Design a protein around this ligand. Structure first.
Ligand SMILES: [Mg+2]
Ligand SMILES: [Mg+2]
Ligand SMILES: [Mg+2]
Lengths: 138, 138, 138
């Protein structure tokens, strides 16, 4: 059965200029994470790539942003992450995170991994898209 | 004494059309969770029910929203959850989550449970409302 | 080596009128936390102190706000926390959290501690600021 598992946590800090998606995937590959999620995140970005609700196109922005929240799941060959950033006036923007977000000064992350489970993306006949599927690691 | 505990995590995915409050409570009942919190959440909503800061009335909205963050505690007979959603333009809205939020394509959740503790809602003479009370499970 | 660790969690509730930064530091000192992060948070604030993206000055606001998300790391002699609050109209504001945020009715927190690691703030030659450094507790 799924859902239940203890968690192992990882703490890491990304460097200025690094692209978030690529670094997260590299960390997942390095540790062969099969059922992870972002348990905590704080930092800053220069370039931001977001896909707004219901939209197909990716919105690319550049400036000075603070990462307010980065949430979602990730695993060996898939992920689903949402990002919220704030600007110099406190105004926020949020959406589906896409490749292209670059670290400004830092990105601090605490990533949780559920050793008893395995996440995968399987087609959902209801939504019409590949959705999160949870199964036993063993 | 309270506060300290190891955590057991649960991963689940809600389906299109399901109402969030009811599904969360069903999961709490199914697993008899006594001291849980939302450790991670990502997804989309069609209907959104929020009670804004200091307001009594619930604001009901319908459209295409992305769940940016869903935070808070929950247990057998109580909860305190806040929700932040983004729209097709990246604009965000936040408030106290109320019953009526419906899943659009999916809602992925990682819920933590603290086995050594028990959450309850007891009247606080200071705030004048029932507030979070933490005690030992044993 | 760093990054990997089990986690111990703490649940607590702050009272009306208390200042968040001071209370968080008091909790860190009381439990001698060396590598913690905010795993969950919900509540309300009256006074809010935020430093917006790229700005030096702290913006002080007072009113009726809901805490939508409080994320970041914290330890014995340092921290990095970002805050997002919503107002009576659902509008949100976000930024680097500064001392001066006061609880309105309550602030519920689940704090994670990574016993196998130790967080510190060391100068980064790349960013030019003291950044998160992760090392073994032993
Ligand atoms: Mg999404
Ligand atoms: Mg509330
Ligand atoms: Mg910051």
């Amino acid at each position: 059965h799924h859902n239940a598992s203890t968690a192992r946590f990882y703490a890491l800090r990304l460097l200025p200029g690094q692209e978030v998606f690529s670094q997260l995937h590299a960390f997942v590959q390095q540790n062969q994470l099969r059922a992870a999620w972002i348990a905590g995140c704080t930092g800053s970005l220069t370039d931001v790539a977001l896909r707004y609700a219901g939209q197909e196109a990716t919105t690319s922005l550049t400036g000075t942003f603070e990462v307010i929240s980065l949430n979602g799941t990730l695993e060996l060959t898939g992920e689903h992450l949402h990002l919220a950033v704030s600007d110099p006036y406190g105004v926020m923007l949020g959406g589906h995170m896409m490749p292209g977000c670059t670290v400004r000064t830092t990105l601090e992350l605490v990533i949780g991994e559920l050793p008893a489970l395995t996440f995968s993306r399987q087609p959902c006949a209801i939504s019409g898209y590949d959705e999160l599927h949870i199964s036993s690691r063993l």
